[PDB]
Design an enzyme around this catalytic site. Sequence first.
Site, short mmCIF file in Angstrom:
data_model
loop_
_atom_site.label_atom_id
_atom_site.label_comp_id
_atom_site.label_asym_id
_atom_site.label_seq_id
_atom_site.Cartn_x
_atom_site.Cartn_y
_atom_site.Cartn_z
N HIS A 20 -95.63 -0.53 -71.69
CA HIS A 20 -95.48 -1.44 -72.82
C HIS A 20 -94.90 -2.67 -72.12
CE1 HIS A 20 -95.09 2.05 -75.95
NE2 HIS A 20 -96.35 1.68 -75.78
N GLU A 67 -91.16 -4.43 -72.44
CA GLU A 67 -89.97 -3.71 -72.04
C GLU A 67 -89.69 -4.09 -70.59
OE1 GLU A 67 -91.36 0.26 -72.96
OE2 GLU A 67 -91.70 -0.39 -75.01
N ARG A 70 -96.88 -6.07 -76.39
CA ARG A 70 -96.65 -4.78 -75.78
C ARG A 70 -97.87 -3.92 -75.51
NH1 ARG A 70 -96.13 -0.26 -79.66
NH2 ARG A 70 -94.14 0.01 -78.52
N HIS A 88 -89.61 3.67 -70.32
CA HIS A 88 -89.72 2.69 -71.40
C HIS A 88 -88.32 2.19 -71.79
CE1 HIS A 88 -93.77 4.45 -72.97
NE2 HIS A 88 -93.52 4.91 -71.76
N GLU A 143 -86.08 6.21 -72.37
CA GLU A 143 -86.12 5.00 -73.21
C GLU A 143 -84.78 4.40 -72.77
OE1 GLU A 143 -88.66 4.25 -75.23
OE2 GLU A 143 -89.70 6.23 -75.47
C1 LIG Z 1 -90.95 5.61 -75.75
C2 LIG Z 1 -91.40 5.80 -77.20
C3 LIG Z 1 -91.37 7.26 -77.68
C4 LIG Z 1 -92.44 8.14 -77.08
C5 LIG Z 1 -92.24 8.77 -75.85
C6 LIG Z 1 -93.23 9.57 -75.28
C7 LIG Z 1 -94.45 9.75 -75.95
C8 LIG Z 1 -94.66 9.13 -77.17
C9 LIG Z 1 -93.65 8.33 -77.73
C10 LIG Z 1 -92.80 5.19 -77.45
O1 LIG Z 1 -93.03 4.78 -78.59
O2 LIG Z 1 -93.61 5.04 -76.50
ZN LIG Z 2 -92.32 1.71 -74.64
#
Ligand SMILES: *C[C@H](Cc1ccccc1)C(=O)O
Ligand SMILES: [Zn+2]
Length: 307
Positions: free
Chosen positions: A69, A72, A127, A196, A270
């Site tokens: 993304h 970020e 993103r 992320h 994250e």
């Molecule tokens: C990081 C966040 C949550 C996520 C992590 C892993 C797989 C799907 C979603 C996102 O929205 O990418």
């Molecule tokens: Zn992300």
Amino acid sequence: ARSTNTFNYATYHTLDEIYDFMDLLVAQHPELVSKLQIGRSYEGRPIYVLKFSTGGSNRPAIWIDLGIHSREWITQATGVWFAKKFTENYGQNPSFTAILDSMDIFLEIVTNPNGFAFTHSENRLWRKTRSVTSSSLCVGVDANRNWDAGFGKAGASSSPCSETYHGKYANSEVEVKSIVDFVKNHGNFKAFLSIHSYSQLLLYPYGYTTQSIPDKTELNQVAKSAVAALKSLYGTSYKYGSIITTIYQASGGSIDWSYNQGIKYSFTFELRDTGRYGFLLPASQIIPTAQETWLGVLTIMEHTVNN
Ligand SMILES: *C[C@H](Cc1ccccc1)C(=O)O
Ligand SMILES: [Zn+2]
């Protein structure tokens, strides 16, 4: 500048600056790291991977990718720092030298080249990818909703202008396909980490289903220790658990696909923070953030080499 030693790691860089830096790093440590082009972005930009290796057979590998993304920024910057740290600690830190003496590390610093470039000249909050060729005015796909793991199911949008649009079909994005083909061809990756921001969470599968993975007790323990490690430097608190149990139901994510390939240690970080700055983290938070995930990521790699 004319050395990675004089490269500023506490400031946000452009795409050219990051691609330049890779060449300098390899130029300085050719024995340990080589750059590999695994494909080209929608707009034709080469997509690169930095492979760290001391040699050997089709050695057990650790995959890490940052910036899928583009907005970020703390992630691509963390990756830059990670690359330099891998060259510094080899021969120095006991545990890290052990991991690199038996495993290779693949590091994709700018997973979404087009989107990144776009965040530097057009929209800082872009993103998605920058793919067009569709029945819409809106461009791009959310590259973390484009994998073949529960593709198209609840958790991603089918609206083209949506910031979480999943795309026409699983792996339609070249940026997603470039990784899938590389990881599958290899057939020996033992860990697949995606990085992320924001909200400080350590996640493991799944996001597209309530079903509990068989390796839950272990991955849960691996996450627990990784979170404790990370927190030790500055006290940054992370919550950990399955994607679905602790963020939301999200389909077409990379870690669910990877875990479904059989790659056990599948996790997503994250990064900082939990909302004050969100995507616009201060440049002063770069090295500190980088320093702490290093601890959480090294924990996971330690588990992978030993377990
Ligand atoms: C990081 C966040 C949550 C996520 C992590 C892993 C797989 C799907 C979603 C996102 O929205 O990418
Ligand atoms: Zn992300």
